[PDB]
From a paper:
MUTYH is a clinically important DNA glycosylase that thwarts mutations by initiating base-excision repair at 8-oxoguanine (OG):A lesions. Improperly placed adenines within pro-mutagenic OG:A base pairs are removed by the adenine glycosylase MUTYH, as the first step in Base Excision Repair (BER). The [4Fe-4S] cluster is coordinated by four cysteine ligands within the N-terminal catalytic domain, while the Zn(II) ion is coordinated by three cysteine ligands in the interdomain connector region (IDC) and one histidine within the catalytic domain. A loop made by two Cys residues that coordinate the [4Fe-4S] cluster, referred to as the iron-sulfur cluster loop, mediates electrostatic interactions with the DNA backbone that are critical for recognition of the lesion containing substrate.
To provide insight into the impact of cancer associated variants (CAVs) and roles of the [4Fe-4S] cofactor in MUTYH function, we obtained the first crystal structure of human MUTYH in complex with DNA and defined structure-function relationships for 12 [4Fe-4S] associated CAVs. Crystals diffracted to high resolution (1.9 Å) with a synchrotron source and refinement yielded final R/Rfree values of 0.180/0.209. In the MUTYH-TSAC, MUTYH embraces the entire DNA helix with contacts mediated by the two functional domains in a manner similar to other MutY homologs. However, within the IDC region we were unable to observe electron density for residues 324-347 in chain A and 319-346 in chain D (there are two copies of the MUTYH-TSAC in the asymmetric unit) nor did we observe electron density for the Zn and its coordination sphere. X-ray absorption spectra of the MUTYH-TSAC crystals lacked the ~9650-eV peak characteristic for Zn. These observations suggest Zn was lost during the crystallization process. The connection involves four residues with strong evolutionary signals as shown by residue coupling correlation analysis, starting with the [4Fe-4S] cluster ligand Cys290 that H-bonds with Arg241, which in turn interacts with Asn238, and lastly this Asn residue H-bonds with the key catalytic residue Asp236. In addition, the amide hydrogen of the side chain of the Asn238 also interacts with the 5’ phosphate of the 1N nucleotide. These connections make use of the multivalent Arg241 and Asn238 residues: Arg241 adopts a C-like shape that enables the positioning of internal NH1ε moiety of the guanidine group to donate a H-bond to the main chain carbonyl amide of Cys290.
Residue numbers in the entry: 86 to 323, 348 to 462, 468 to 507
Write the structure that this text describes.
DNA sequence: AAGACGTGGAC
DNA sequence: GTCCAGTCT
């Protein structure tokens, strides 16, 4: 931790001064700063910080304002359906986030009388989907509590400023980072300080090509001070790799490679009054892509003939007997999840001329807005481009 | 206390 | 292509 109170003070002043001048104009920042009711403000921050988990700012811009305009308050979100939530979340990824946001709103309404808890400890304790980061973000930004937070951005800044080379995922290191953040967080402007540290990590102290020469905390940064000395060395010196400079920190966490999986899926198309329709069925409410809609799918089979037989069996559960000779193998889609690389073999079957529950026939316009994973949107685009004679293009 | 859980923007 | 932008169990 920082040993000199003078430095802690300078860190805060420099960072906040830079932030007040350089911060990006972000929709949830404006909305939180401008909302005067505390339960509305806290809800607005809550939504944005859930959407931002493992998701880039540029992506969340496309979702946040639409969410807040539809469901401006806890109570609006609490009364909505999970199907509606999943439609709005389609494309954001990690769909349990949307589900827990709505469950959390229901819990605040039903069990806490509509009142958002006002401290990071009670937010974390009471709200599913709200871990230590989101709770401290809501508490500092919405309520002004002097709690510091560590996300990926802040961990990178702190590991460079303090030259921490050990593995940041380790319990010892993660503990040091949270203590540093709690030491540094400005008591009078805790929310802006936390947003400023994240902003610095996102726009200046970046994963690669950090802009140290424009950085507000350069003179306090240990990695920078070591790089400045080594820039001058007129002779080589023969785990710190001089050619990486400050990007030596943090130690690059290596992801476990993804499990390979394969599946076969079929787009079934039929004419309709208001346009052609395709068949969607609903996934189970647990596990991968829980509760989202998809084209009927079966697991992989060790021969083409077996694969077609399984697919037609699955398809017939939902549509009745179908012409097997019209089934076409159209292509494949290789879709990456964090832990699975899933290869879908795409089939189509267009019919030339009742619906069990758990199935839906949708037009092209209805499908574009439906609660479907991006994997299935890719599948549909293969069908669109490759199925002879389709009208869905 | 590693693995489940989506997707895409940058380089 | 590879990396990075949290929560829960
Ligand atoms: S001087 Fe460079 S490495 Fe240090 S905090 Fe600033 S941008 Fe990051």
């Amino acid at each position: 931790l920082f040993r000199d109170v003078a430095e802690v003070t300078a860190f805060r002043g420099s960072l906040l001064s830079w932030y007040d001048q350089e911060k990006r104009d972000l929709p949830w920042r404006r909305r939180a700063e401008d909302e005067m009711d505390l339960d509305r403000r806290a809800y607005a921050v809550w939504v944005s910080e859930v959407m931002l988990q493992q998701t880039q700012v540029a992506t969340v811009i496309n979702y946040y304002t639409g969410w807040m305009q539809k469901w401006p308050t806890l109570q609006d979100l609490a009364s909505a359906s999970l199907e509606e939530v999943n439609q709005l979340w389609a494309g954001l990824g990690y769909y349990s986030r949307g589900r827990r946001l709505q469950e959390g709103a229901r819990k605040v309404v039903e069990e806490l009388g509509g009142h958002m808890p006002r401290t990071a400890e009670t937010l974390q304790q009471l709200l599913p989907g709200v871990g230590r980061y989101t709770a401290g973000a809501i508490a500092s930004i919405a309520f002004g509590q002097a709690t510091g937070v560590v996300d990926g951005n802040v961990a990178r800044v702190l590991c460079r400023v303090r030259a921490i080379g050990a593995d940041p995922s380790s319990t010892l290191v993660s503990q040091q980072l949270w203590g540093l953040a709690q030491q540094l967080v400005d008591p009078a402007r805790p929310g802006d300080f936390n947003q400023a540290a994240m902003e610095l990590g996102a726009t200046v102290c970046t994963p690669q090509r950090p802009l140290c020469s424009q950085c507000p905390v350069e003179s306090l940064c240990r990695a920078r001070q070591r790089v400045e000395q080594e820039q001058l060395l007129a002779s080589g010196s023969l785990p710190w790799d001089q050619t990486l400079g400050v990007v030596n920190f943090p130690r690059k966490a290596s992801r476990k490679p993804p499990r390979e999986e394969s599946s076969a899926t079929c787009v079934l198309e039929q004419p309709g009054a208001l346009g052609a329709q395709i068949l969607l069925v609903q996934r189970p409410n647990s596990g991968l892509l829980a509760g989202l809609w998809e084209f009927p799918s079966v697991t992989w089979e060790p021969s083409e003939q077996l694969q077609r037989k399984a697919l037609l069996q699955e398809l017939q559960r939902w549509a009745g007997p179908l012409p097997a000779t019209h089934l076409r193998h159209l292509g494949e889609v290789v879709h990456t999840f964090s832990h699975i690389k899933l290869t879908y073999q795409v089939y189509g079957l267009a019919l030339e001329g009742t619906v069990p529950p758990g199935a839906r026939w949708l037009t092209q316009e209805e499908f574009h807005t439906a609660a479907v994973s991006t994997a299935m949107k890719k599948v549909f685009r293969v069908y669109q481009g490759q199925q002879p004679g389709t009208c869905m293009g």
